[PDB]
């Protein structure tokens, strides 16, 4: 009883030390994986140009959506789709895998939400500061990798950065890894929406619709 605690203790202290350096190994491999991914696209664009061709980027697989409209006076079809994407509240936001199946859920929902393509720096800053998990209902703040590993470990993903990697890459467990994240409750943009009147397309005078790369500047003022 007096000795066997140092048994169970020194045990976990080593299995912690082990899980730690695994994350330290993985996160290093993700850093290289991104750094080379972006770097290839840049040169591939250069190469096309030198060849007198045009490199067309692949369409984005990943889209972030925040609901910018109030909860009153919504048509019933969009009201469903809005719930089915878990944005029931103003400024709240989630991630969407981009397929034709959810592409039409962005068409129907368009006047009530602003969406675009989030950058790594966004997804990171989202998950660290506003990242919360779903554990038996209750909304759990993600402050310790064990919390992730507990729920998402069966998929891999023992680290908050494995979550962040799973998200930004889409890939195999995106459905589950994403649905684990509690919808991000964002504040209103600090510095404003930059347009007088929100509900009009981004093409038209801003706020609502697909602003593509510009979603990032937005979310980071809200977040």
């Amino acid at each position: 009883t007096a000795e066997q605690v140092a048994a169970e203790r020194a045990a976990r202290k080593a299995a912690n030390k082990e899980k730690r350096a695994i994350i330290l190994e993985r996160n290093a491999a993700y850093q290289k994986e991104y750094e080379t991914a972006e770097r290839n696209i840049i040169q591939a664009k250069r190469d096309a140009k030198a060849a007198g061709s045009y490199y067309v980027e692949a369409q984005h697989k990943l889209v972030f959506v925040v609901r910018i409209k109030g909860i009153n006076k919504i048509p019933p079809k969009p009201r469903k789709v809005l719930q089915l994407l878990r944005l029931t509240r103003i400024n709240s936001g989630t991630f969407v895998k981009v397929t034709k199946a959810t592409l039409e859920l962005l068409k129907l929902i368009e006047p009530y939400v602003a969406y675009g393509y989030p950058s790594y720096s966004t997804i990171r800053q989202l998950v660290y500061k506003r990242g919360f998990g779903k554990i038996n209902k209750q909304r759990v703040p993600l402050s310790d990798n064990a919390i992730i590993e507990a729920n998402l470990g069966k998929y891999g993903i023992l680290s908050i950065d494995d979550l962040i990697h799973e998200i930004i890459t889409v890939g195999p467990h995106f459905k589950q890894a994403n649905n684990f994240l509690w919808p991000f409750k964002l504040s209103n943009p600090s510095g404003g929406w930059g347009v007088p009147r929100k509900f009009k397309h981004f093409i038209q005078g801003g706020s609502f619709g697909n602003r593509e790369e510009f979603i990032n500047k937005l979310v980071k003022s809200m977040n």
Binding site: R20, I23, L24, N27, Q43, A51, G52, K129, N145, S159
Partner: protein, 51 residues
């Protein structure tokens, strides 16, 4: 009992995600990419500056 924001509070930034240490120490928030000389051919700029 308190949410702490890893993007401040370095204790936490290290608590999640080591390699924060490595990142900072190796910089690579910076890190100049290598230097290549590819020039866009001809037709590209012919059409770029076209009417």
């Amino acid at each position: 009992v308190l949410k702490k924001n890893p993007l401040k509070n370095k204790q936490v930034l290290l608590r999640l995600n080591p390699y924060a240490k490595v990142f900072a120490a190796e910089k690579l928030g910076s890190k100049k990419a290598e230097k290549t000389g590819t020039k866009p051919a001809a037709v590209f700029t012919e059409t770029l500056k076209h009417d």
